[PDB]
Amino acid sequence: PTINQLVRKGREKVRKKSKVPALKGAPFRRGVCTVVRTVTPKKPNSALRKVAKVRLTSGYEVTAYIPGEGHNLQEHSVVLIRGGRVKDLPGVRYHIVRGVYDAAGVKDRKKSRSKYGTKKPKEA
Amino acid sequence: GRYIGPVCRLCRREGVKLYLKGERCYSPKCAMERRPYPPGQHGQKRARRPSDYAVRLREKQKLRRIYGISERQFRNLFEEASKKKGVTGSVFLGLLESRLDNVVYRLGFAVSRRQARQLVRHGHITVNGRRVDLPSYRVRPGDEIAVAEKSRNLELIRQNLEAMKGRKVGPWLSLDVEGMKGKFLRLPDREDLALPVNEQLVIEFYSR
Amino acid sequence: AKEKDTIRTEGVVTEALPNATFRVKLDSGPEILAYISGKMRMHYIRILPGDRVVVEITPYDPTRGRIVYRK
Amino acid sequence: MVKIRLARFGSKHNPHYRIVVTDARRKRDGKYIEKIGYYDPRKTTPDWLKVDVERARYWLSVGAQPTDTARRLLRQAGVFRQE
Amino acid sequence: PKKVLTGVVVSDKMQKTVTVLVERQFPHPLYGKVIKRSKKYLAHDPEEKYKLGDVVEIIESRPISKRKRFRVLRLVESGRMDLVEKYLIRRQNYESLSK
Amino acid sequence: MLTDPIADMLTRIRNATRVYKESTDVPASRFKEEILRILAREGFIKGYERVDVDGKPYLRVYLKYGPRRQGPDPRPEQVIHHIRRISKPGRRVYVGVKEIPRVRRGLGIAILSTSKGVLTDREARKLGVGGELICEVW
RNA sequence: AGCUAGUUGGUGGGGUAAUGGCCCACCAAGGCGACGACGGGUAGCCGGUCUGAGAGGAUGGCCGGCCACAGGGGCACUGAGACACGGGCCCCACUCCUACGGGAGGCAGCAGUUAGGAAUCUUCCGCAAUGGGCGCAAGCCUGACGGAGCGACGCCGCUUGGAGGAAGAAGCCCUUCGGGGUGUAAACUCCUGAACCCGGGACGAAACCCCCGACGAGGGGACUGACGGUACCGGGGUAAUAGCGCCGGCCAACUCCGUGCCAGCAGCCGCGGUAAUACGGAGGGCGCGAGCGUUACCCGGAUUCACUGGGCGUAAAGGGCGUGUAGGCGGCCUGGGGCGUCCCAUGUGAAAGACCACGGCUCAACCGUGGGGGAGCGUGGGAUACGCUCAGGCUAGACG
Ligand SMILES: [Mg+2]
Ligand SMILES: [Mg+2]
Ligand SMILES: [Mg+2]
Ligand SMILES: [Mg+2]
Ligand SMILES: [Mg+2]
Ligand SMILES: [Mg+2]
Ligand SMILES: [Mg+2]
Ligand SMILES: [Mg+2]
Ligand SMILES: [Mg+2]
Ligand SMILES: [Mg+2]
Ligand SMILES: [Mg+2]
Ligand SMILES: [Mg+2]
Ligand SMILES: [Mg+2]
Ligand SMILES: [Mg+2]
Ligand SMILES: [Mg+2]
Ligand SMILES: [Mg+2]
Ligand SMILES: [Mg+2]
Ligand SMILES: [Mg+2]
Ligand SMILES: [Mg+2]
Ligand SMILES: [Mg+2]
Ligand SMILES: [Mg+2]
Ligand SMILES: [Mg+2]
Ligand SMILES: [Mg+2]
Ligand SMILES: [Mg+2]
Ligand SMILES: [Mg+2]
Ligand SMILES: [Mg+2]
Ligand SMILES: [Mg+2]
Ligand SMILES: [Mg+2]
Ligand SMILES: [Mg+2]
Ligand SMILES: [Mg+2]
Ligand SMILES: [Mg+2]
Ligand SMILES: [Mg+2]
Ligand SMILES: [Mg+2]
Ligand SMILES: [Mg+2]
Ligand SMILES: [Mg+2]
Ligand SMILES: [Mg+2]
Ligand SMILES: [Mg+2]
Ligand SMILES: [Mg+2]
Ligand SMILES: [Mg+2]
Ligand SMILES: [Mg+2]
Ligand SMILES: [Mg+2]
């Protein structure tokens, strides 16, 4: 437009939408689990994905993805949220970190380790 | 700190000679001389087209490995160079050279850069009358550097000196071959050095 | 690893849902939204409510299976 | 009260003091009126201490008061010197 | 300097008090464009001499009231009812703007 | 409204350059005349004069071009590649001695109305004065 | 979208160090507002910080300024100064004692407990330095401060060896069975000598005091150490922690086996339903490296809120048009004013940083010294082309 218009009104600033209500911009959040269940992905992909319905110390009821290949998660398991969309699962926004709390290191991982929070094999 | 471990492998990866063993990298043995190909399995695989980032990256790696440095340090040096007035590529190079280990190497107090660094570390080199033990020492021009007095007596250094007896010492430096001494005179230039570098590429890589 | 605890149980097809997600009244007991295998999708194999299909069921939560065998 | 005092800047073990003119009720690091000189305890430099004399004299005249160390420093660098 | 300001008498509806309109022109901090920016002021005048429509010199002063911090130095131009009227019309419109 | 005059003049010039008629007609101002003079000095136009169209004073513009060009797109080589009025009326910009913008690194020019008449970039620098950034030419 | 009744202005008084609707008595009936009032939400604010080519944008941790609040609220007193952080009173909320009548409290001081929470530190030594405050002084106080403790929390520095050493051991992996890879890597030779132990050992600290000099200037003397037997130097002296990410494209780096749209990976495209350079493993490689990756959050890339620097026939997007208010914007000539605007001088722009130079801690980070710049704002002077303004005219706009 014309600078006069700008002067009159101003530019409507990019109010940055939050991708994550982990509240506060809380870089993690620990919480307890409603139900450990399993979900169908979408139109492109098909695989029984291991999810957890999670209640948080923020106060929200959000679903969360569990990593690895063999989990050890119950229900009143104390869990730690990572945050970060998986693409496939809808309504799903937060990962869980395996390695601390009631999510321990996935055994039989020796390559991709830290991301899954599993300790080192003492080499011979 | 150090890279440490397998060296001539880096040279192989680069494809242009390093002289990073010194001798050995001088004898028919750097693997560059006898073996001239990428390391690991696909060492003999028909060359992938290097993406334009990749070439730059490779060049940077070459350069960084040449003087034997941590990458953070290198980055800092680059930043400093950029901050300074002049030709960044040339000035940066000069500054890099102006590190103590490099100086030691180029004056031939040790025959390899790693070796030079080691020597610097243990309490061997003496800056204007006092020992310094840090590879990242920035030696400003017109500066006098010696071998230590009670460390004056070691055989290796003598041998190295002898090797540097007869042949030329880089234009910006000069050495005393008897009193175990050496001057760093001028802050080295682009044309003053025969490096395998193309510093422009490195600079470009850094920009991002 | 590939942790195999998968229960290979048969069942009569109950309710035809979208996406080829067939409620299958199993020989085990309760019906779940068990969907169709990728193999079946590839070969173009139509299931109707009236077949005894094999559903490969998970022990974590018996709510979702997988129709593997053609009828 | 208006005080002429050293202020610590610098580092741990490696101290550095500014001969400064400031207020009584101020932070030892605080917004002083006027930087008048400098002194390093470590004697590390040949030009370790230096004051500007004229300004110091002026401050004294108004009625600024030196604390002890500051006073000593002034004496050393010649301000209380009379001729 | 006891700050010196140019502006017009928009209102006398008061004992001794004059209302002044300083149209200070300023640049915008961003878009370059210069804006006629108006601020109202209230000046003490110990005479009632200054009438509805006069441009006057307003001086930074010690306060006499809850926002009334200027004496009138002097008259500049008497009787420019144009700039008066604009303001009045704007004020009138303000009543029309609501609801 | 023929609203800004200078801008209008510039536009006319640009149009002329685009469609290659060695002369154009624009209404008459002192400001305009001064600008034209500056342009002439610099070399962007062969000259000008001021004649009459309908009992109204008018400034003719004797344009300039570079040599008739080779190959495809014959179009005589253009000397005024581009023109732009920066201090657009209402959006009025003001620059100082440390704010004269080095236009094309030196191969076009800016035009700066100053206290010291109507004048150019180098001149401004010499005289150490600032003013209004009416226009940019390259 | 209207708000306002001590609310706006007045006279007097009171109160105050001092103006004042701060408050009161009485009179007037205004005032502000779409140039964004009141209301809501949000929020300490800045020097700054990070980013960014810059303009900007976001941020305001520490460090310095200034405000504000010391359970919540409200108020005074005293004093030069508070409406008073470790001073008072009173109500409410809470924890402590109670012989039930009543009091005690306030760590948002250091240290820690407790809670929340992903997450944050030693119930540390010292008055030695500097500052504080009292005191003639000695001195006394000081969780200001100085330091140590813990944490790869961030940045920087250094170690985890180097010189040899096969046209190439084993180990392990592919194979087109020749061979290649790992890899000069190893082993082994030589040397060095971080760690480590012994020998010393600070600089930081010379004053305040004392005497000669008048209790001045000046001169001599003494005492003074938490850090810390630390740093550092002298001698010896051991080859002495490597990890994590990724490896389809972006994007640096590929093969084999396992697995079969399953298990899984994912930042996006998307990979996987039997030869997966995308999944699990194994080598190889690549990236950095005592760290690297994940997550949060900000800027960048987004010239994707566009002032620099975007658009609106069909992509999001011209309102249905008219009249018209504020507003914005404006023809040609001549003169004045000089508000904008420019210029020159200065005053300011505290320090720290950011920038240059130099110096110091064995380099660097860190830190010092000196300079320079600095948007903006104030004052003095000028300039008048350009906007503005006032005056006069002009007919090309407009109207008749
Ligand atoms: Mg490091
Ligand atoms: Mg299975
Ligand atoms: Mg009343
Ligand atoms: Mg009064
Ligand atoms: Mg009031
Ligand atoms: Mg609120
Ligand atoms: Mg802010
Ligand atoms: Mg602060
Ligand atoms: Mg207070
Ligand atoms: Mg209280
Ligand atoms: Mg209170
Ligand atoms: Mg008192
Ligand atoms: Mg009092
Ligand atoms: Mg109180
Ligand atoms: Mg505390
Ligand atoms: Mg606790
Ligand atoms: Mg907790
Ligand atoms: Mg601490
Ligand atoms: Mg004590
Ligand atoms: Mg003291
Ligand atoms: Mg006593
Ligand atoms: Mg401390
Ligand atoms: Mg550390
Ligand atoms: Mg070796
Ligand atoms: Mg000892
Ligand atoms: Mg080893
Ligand atoms: Mg992975
Ligand atoms: Mg990938
Ligand atoms: Mg793989
Ligand atoms: Mg990190
Ligand atoms: Mg634009
Ligand atoms: Mg667009
Ligand atoms: Mg459309
Ligand atoms: Mg319309
Ligand atoms: Mg109008
Ligand atoms: Mg106008
Ligand atoms: Mg400063
Ligand atoms: Mg400085
Ligand atoms: Mg130095
Ligand atoms: Mg007129
Ligand atoms: Mg007509």
Tab-separated table of C-alpha atoms (C1' of nucleotides) in Angstrom, chain G residues 4-304:
chain	number	residue	atom	x	y	z
G	4	U	C1'	-14.827	11.239	33.513
G	5	A	C1'	-17.739	14.007	38.934
G	6	G	C1'	-12.303	15.553	42.916
G	7	U	C1'	-13.581	14.907	37.281
G	8	U	C1'	-11.408	19.866	34.575
G	9	G	C1'	-10.796	25.003	35.813
G	10	G	C1'	-11.351	28.870	39.717
G	11	U	C1'	-10.906	31.731	44.841
G	12	G	C1'	-9.196	30.792	49.746
G	13	G	C1'	-7.093	27.586	53.134
G	14	G	C1'	-4.695	23.330	54.786
G	15	G	C1'	-0.621	19.981	53.950
G	16	U	C1'	4.472	19.797	51.984
G	17	A	C1'	11.670	21.013	51.772
G	18	A	C1'	8.830	22.655	47.377
G	19	U	C1'	4.761	23.348	42.629
G	20	G	C1'	0.124	21.128	42.280
G	21	G	C1'	-6.979	18.993	42.648
G	22	C	C1'	-2.263	16.412	47.005
G	23	C	C1'	-6.714	17.319	49.974
G	24	C	C1'	-10.767	20.339	51.771
G	25	A	C1'	-14.788	24.537	51.650
G	26	C	C1'	-17.366	27.042	47.881
G	27	C	C1'	-18.174	28.774	42.686
G	28	A	C1'	-17.777	27.679	37.319
G	29	A	C1'	-19.015	23.147	33.974
G	30	G	C1'	-15.565	21.633	31.839
G	31	G	C1'	-11.736	18.063	30.305
G	32	C	C1'	-9.843	14.007	27.396
G	33	G	C1'	-11.141	11.025	23.090
G	34	A	C1'	-10.854	7.303	16.466
G	35	C	C1'	-3.534	12.022	15.979
G	36	G	C1'	-6.716	5.814	20.023
G	37	A	C1'	-9.110	7.958	25.545
G	38	C	C1'	-11.213	4.453	29.182
G	39	G	C1'	-11.364	-1.038	29.423
G	40	G	C1'	-9.025	-5.878	28.781
G	41	G	C1'	-4.770	-8.612	28.151
G	42	U	C1'	0.351	-8.744	28.326
G	43	A	C1'	4.975	-6.467	30.610
G	44	G	C1'	9.617	-3.961	34.996
G	45	C	C1'	12.280	-0.290	32.026
G	46	C	C1'	17.086	0.843	30.009
G	47	G	C1'	22.613	0.840	28.993
G	48	G	C1'	22.227	-3.665	26.720
G	49	U	C1'	22.069	-8.957	24.674
G	50	C	C1'	21.514	-12.326	20.420
G	51	U	C1'	20.521	-12.182	15.667
G	52	G	C1'	20.505	-9.722	11.181
G	53	A	C1'	24.068	-7.323	5.045
G	54	G	C1'	21.551	-3.705	7.104
G	55	A	C1'	16.898	-1.598	8.300
G	56	G	C1'	14.667	-4.247	11.513
G	57	G	C1'	13.019	-8.277	15.000
G	58	A	C1'	13.074	-10.512	19.456
G	59	U	C1'	15.040	-10.412	24.104
G	60	G	C1'	16.273	-7.513	28.940
G	61	G	C1'	20.025	-13.647	32.277
G	62	C	C1'	24.504	-11.973	34.598
G	63	C	C1'	27.190	-6.976	34.841
G	64	G	C1'	25.781	-1.025	35.519
G	65	G	C1'	21.830	2.557	35.938
G	66	C	C1'	16.748	3.568	37.688
G	67	C	C1'	11.822	2.123	39.494
G	68	A	C1'	8.978	-1.002	42.447
G	69	C	C1'	8.102	-4.602	46.521
G	70	A	C1'	9.665	-6.762	50.898
G	71	G	C1'	3.255	-12.773	53.573
G	72	G	C1'	-1.443	-9.579	51.411
G	73	G	C1'	-3.097	-4.627	52.341
G	74	G	C1'	-3.113	0.322	54.769
G	75	C	C1'	-0.770	4.004	57.533
G	76	A	C1'	2.209	7.065	59.889
G	77	C	C1'	6.374	8.152	63.302
G	78	U	C1'	11.620	9.430	63.640
G	79	G	C1'	15.137	11.657	61.084
G	80	A	C1'	19.075	15.077	56.272
G	81	G	C1'	16.850	11.400	53.882
G	82	A	C1'	11.959	6.200	54.392
G	83	C	C1'	6.032	5.693	54.418
G	84	A	C1'	11.491	2.365	55.914
G	85	C	C1'	13.735	-5.382	53.469
G	86	G	C1'	16.572	-8.194	58.867
G	87	G	C1'	12.150	-0.460	62.732
G	88	G	C1'	6.489	0.470	64.698
G	89	C	C1'	1.012	-0.032	64.752
G	90	C	C1'	-3.713	-2.319	62.755
G	91	C	C1'	-6.943	-5.785	59.779
G	92	C	C1'	-6.665	-10.414	56.818
G	93	A	C1'	-3.938	-15.053	55.346
G	94	C	C1'	-0.778	-18.532	57.463
G	95	U	C1'	3.268	-21.540	60.713
G	96	C	C1'	4.886	-21.415	66.242
G	97	C	C1'	4.235	-21.597	71.615
G	98	U	C1'	-0.570	-21.152	75.353
G	99	A	C1'	-1.865	-22.313	82.620
G	100	C	C1'	-7.005	-20.545	75.989
G	101	G	C1'	-6.592	-14.514	78.675
G	102	G	C1'	-2.673	-13.809	74.381
G	103	G	C1'	1.815	-13.310	71.873
G	104	A	C1'	5.915	-14.906	68.375
G	105	G	C1'	7.135	-14.584	63.575
G	106	G	C1'	8.548	-13.368	57.506
G	107	C	C1'	15.266	-16.040	54.128
G	108	A	C1'	12.111	-11.964	47.122
G	109	G	C1'	20.295	-11.474	52.454
G	110	C	C1'	24.094	-15.678	52.156
G	111	A	C1'	23.942	-21.091	52.927
G	112	G	C1'	20.418	-24.903	52.967
G	113	U	C1'	15.541	-27.533	54.059
G	114	U	C1'	11.024	-28.183	51.993
G	115	A	C1'	7.355	-27.902	47.310
G	116	G	C1'	6.577	-27.314	42.602
G	117	G	C1'	9.163	-28.551	38.628
G	118	A	C1'	12.755	-31.151	32.966
G	119	A	C1'	16.009	-28.177	35.554
G	120	U	C1'	19.855	-24.759	39.250
G	121	C	C1'	25.170	-24.760	43.713
G	122	U	C1'	28.590	-25.604	49.444
G	123	U	C1'	23.895	-25.379	56.340
G	124	C	C1'	32.386	-23.469	52.873
G	125	C	C1'	37.007	-20.358	54.601
G	126	G	C1'	38.481	-15.083	55.153
G	127	C	C1'	38.614	-9.611	57.001
G	128	A	C1'	44.247	-10.476	53.670
G	129	A	C1'	42.752	-6.856	49.427
G	130	U	C1'	38.850	-3.175	48.074
G	131	G	C1'	34.307	-0.739	49.671
G	132	G	C1'	30.889	0.151	53.762
G	133	G	C1'	30.018	2.258	58.747
G	134	C	C1'	31.313	3.773	63.703
G	135	G	C1'	35.401	5.571	66.197
G	136	C	C1'	40.799	10.643	67.858
G	137	A	C1'	42.784	6.086	67.460
G	138	A	C1'	43.800	1.293	68.095
G	139	G	C1'	40.095	-1.480	66.776
G	140	C	C1'	35.202	-3.658	66.093
G	141	C	C1'	31.586	-5.227	62.695
G	142	U	C1'	30.744	-6.755	57.309
G	143	G	C1'	27.136	-14.189	53.794
G	144	A	C1'	29.045	-6.146	50.445
G	145	C	C1'	33.231	-8.407	48.572
G	146	G	C1'	37.285	-11.832	48.006
G	147	G	C1'	37.868	-16.689	47.138
G	148	A	C1'	37.544	-21.856	47.404
G	149	G	C1'	33.290	-26.157	46.811
G	150	C	C1'	29.910	-28.579	43.036
G	151	G	C1'	28.047	-28.980	37.627
G	152	A	C1'	31.568	-30.253	30.329
G	153	C	C1'	26.291	-24.940	32.398
G	154	G	C1'	28.746	-21.556	28.594
G	155	C	C1'	33.443	-19.934	26.253
G	156	C	C1'	38.584	-20.663	25.525
G	157	G	C1'	43.207	-23.545	26.382
G	158	C	C1'	45.706	-28.386	26.793
G	159	U	C1'	46.229	-33.964	27.288
G	160	U	C1'	44.559	-38.569	25.431
G	161	G	C1'	51.764	-39.208	21.794
G	162	G	C1'	55.494	-38.489	18.032
G	163	A	C1'	59.522	-40.465	14.643
G	164	G	C1'	60.003	-44.973	12.103
G	165	G	C1'	57.316	-49.433	10.549
G	166	A	C1'	54.741	-54.562	5.033
G	167	A	C1'	53.755	-53.177	-2.254
G	168	G	C1'	50.476	-54.782	3.287
G	169	A	C1'	50.210	-60.020	9.736
G	170	A	C1'	46.262	-61.275	12.613
G	171	G	C1'	41.285	-59.770	13.797
G	172	C	C1'	36.926	-58.612	11.098
G	173	C	C1'	34.432	-57.719	6.355
G	174	C	C1'	33.061	-58.031	1.566
G	175	U	C1'	34.456	-60.691	-3.407
G	176	U	C1'	33.566	-60.852	-10.015
G	177	C	C1'	37.644	-65.737	-5.611
G	178	G	C1'	42.480	-63.237	-8.405
G	179	G	C1'	41.823	-59.553	-4.631
G	180	G	C1'	40.384	-55.189	-2.033
G	181	G	C1'	39.089	-52.898	2.412
G	182	U	C1'	40.200	-51.835	7.474
G	183	G	C1'	45.651	-49.283	7.275
G	184	U	C1'	51.101	-47.100	8.952
G	185	A	C1'	46.622	-48.289	11.862
G	186	A	C1'	48.703	-52.145	14.679
G	187	A	C1'	52.558	-54.901	16.764
G	188	C	C1'	57.659	-53.929	17.381
G	189	U	C1'	62.291	-50.155	17.471
G	190	C	C1'	63.535	-45.145	19.058
G	191	C	C1'	62.438	-40.709	21.531
G	192	U	C1'	59.367	-37.379	24.534
G	193	G	C1'	57.653	-37.321	29.374
G	194	A	C1'	50.763	-35.096	30.691
G	195	A	C1'	49.513	-37.856	35.199
G	196	C	C1'	52.779	-38.488	39.731
G	197	C	C1'	56.377	-37.807	43.611
G	198	C	C1'	60.118	-34.972	45.738
G	199	G	C1'	62.986	-29.436	46.266
G	200	G	C1'	61.709	-24.521	46.864
G	201	G	C1'	57.872	-20.978	46.565
G	202	A	C1'	55.004	-16.036	45.617
G	203	C	C1'	53.227	-11.491	43.173
G	204	G	C1'	48.588	-9.618	45.286
G	205	A	C1'	50.672	-5.445	50.698
G	206	A	C1'	51.750	-0.721	51.793
G	207	A	C1'	49.353	1.796	53.976
G	208	C	C1'	46.136	3.213	58.081
G	209	C	C1'	50.182	2.981	63.238
G	210	C	C1'	54.917	4.676	65.272
G	211	C	C1'	59.115	8.339	65.624
G	212	C	C1'	62.164	12.692	63.111
G	213	G	C1'	59.373	16.896	60.584
G	214	A	C1'	54.187	21.552	63.518
G	215	C	C1'	49.531	16.229	64.271
G	216	G	C1'	51.403	19.720	56.972
G	217	A	C1'	54.785	18.194	52.863
G	218	G	C1'	58.405	14.803	53.238
G	219	G	C1'	61.661	10.727	55.544
G	220	G	C1'	62.670	6.079	58.177
G	221	G	C1'	60.358	1.540	60.727
G	222	A	C1'	57.107	-2.207	62.009
G	223	C	C1'	52.923	-5.379	61.795
G	224	U	C1'	49.920	-7.514	58.421
G	225	G	C1'	47.491	-13.778	53.500
G	226	A	C1'	41.260	-16.538	53.141
G	227	C	C1'	43.005	-17.994	48.471
G	228	G	C1'	47.216	-21.785	49.633
G	229	G	C1'	51.973	-24.953	50.329
G	230	U	C1'	47.953	-22.885	45.472
G	231	A	C1'	50.044	-20.758	40.972
G	232	C	C1'	54.891	-21.114	39.323
G	233	C	C1'	59.951	-22.412	38.819
G	234	G	C1'	64.154	-26.769	39.951
G	235	G	C1'	64.798	-32.322	39.620
G	236	G	C1'	63.083	-36.866	38.587
G	237	G	C1'	59.340	-39.477	36.067
G	238	U	C1'	54.610	-43.481	33.479
G	239	A	C1'	52.722	-44.117	26.799
G	240	A	C1'	49.047	-42.510	29.964
G	241	U	C1'	40.080	-41.552	29.261
G	242	A	C1'	37.350	-41.667	23.107
G	243	G	C1'	32.946	-40.510	22.237
G	244	C	C1'	28.568	-39.333	19.898
G	245	G	C1'	25.619	-38.242	15.494
G	246	C	C1'	24.659	-39.480	10.726
G	247	C	C1'	25.286	-41.982	6.228
G	248	G	C1'	18.312	-41.531	-0.241
G	249	G	C1'	17.757	-35.925	-1.507
G	250	C	C1'	18.608	-31.327	1.008
G	251	C	C1'	23.630	-32.765	3.466
G	252	A	C1'	29.766	-34.450	4.044
G	253	A	C1'	29.383	-39.978	3.982
G	254	C	C1'	27.645	-47.294	0.905
G	255	U	C1'	28.090	-51.702	0.960
G	256	C	C1'	26.442	-56.755	2.982
G	257	C	C1'	23.264	-59.663	6.226
G	258	G	C1'	18.643	-59.653	9.081
G	259	U	C1'	13.534	-58.117	8.351
G	260	G	C1'	9.035	-58.334	4.586
G	261	C	C1'	3.754	-51.613	4.546
G	262	C	C1'	5.624	-56.137	9.845
G	263	A	C1'	9.057	-54.533	13.031
G	264	G	C1'	10.327	-49.758	12.542
G	265	C	C1'	12.620	-44.362	10.907
G	266	A	C1'	11.177	-39.543	10.379
G	267	G	C1'	12.757	-32.527	9.903
G	268	C	C1'	10.035	-32.710	5.129
G	269	C	C1'	9.490	-35.365	0.609
G	270	G	C1'	8.527	-39.680	2.351
G	271	C	C1'	11.008	-45.000	3.045
G	272	G	C1'	9.270	-50.421	4.428
G	273	G	C1'	3.959	-55.170	1.455
G	274	U	C1'	11.442	-60.334	-0.422
G	275	A	C1'	18.370	-57.822	-3.992
G	276	A	C1'	15.473	-51.713	1.248
G	277	U	C1'	22.738	-46.588	-0.917
G	278	A	C1'	16.175	-44.403	3.871
G	279	C	C1'	14.108	-49.949	8.985
G	280	G	C1'	17.545	-53.593	12.980
G	281	G	C1'	22.772	-55.235	12.739
G	282	A	C1'	28.029	-55.116	10.838
G	283	G	C1'	32.001	-53.034	8.591
G	284	G	C1'	33.535	-48.856	5.867
G	285	G	C1'	33.023	-43.685	5.571
G	286	C	C1'	31.717	-38.663	6.890
G	287	G	C1'	30.960	-34.786	10.579
G	288	C	C1'	32.776	-32.742	14.928
G	289	G	C1'	35.497	-34.084	19.454
G	290	A	C1'	36.011	-34.121	25.609
G	291	G	C1'	31.956	-33.659	23.404
G	292	C	C1'	28.187	-34.586	19.952
G	293	G	C1'	23.088	-35.250	19.107
G	294	U	C1'	17.578	-34.671	20.792
G	295	U	C1'	14.036	-31.223	22.770
G	296	A	C1'	12.358	-26.030	23.987
G	297	C	C1'	12.885	-20.841	22.444
G	298	C	C1'	14.477	-16.523	19.422
G	299	C	C1'	16.402	-14.340	15.063
G	300	G	C1'	17.789	-15.722	10.224
G	301	G	C1'	16.614	-18.011	5.682
G	302	A	C1'	10.560	-15.509	4.920
G	303	U	C1'	11.590	-9.381	0.158
G	304	U	C1'	6.040	-15.080	4.008
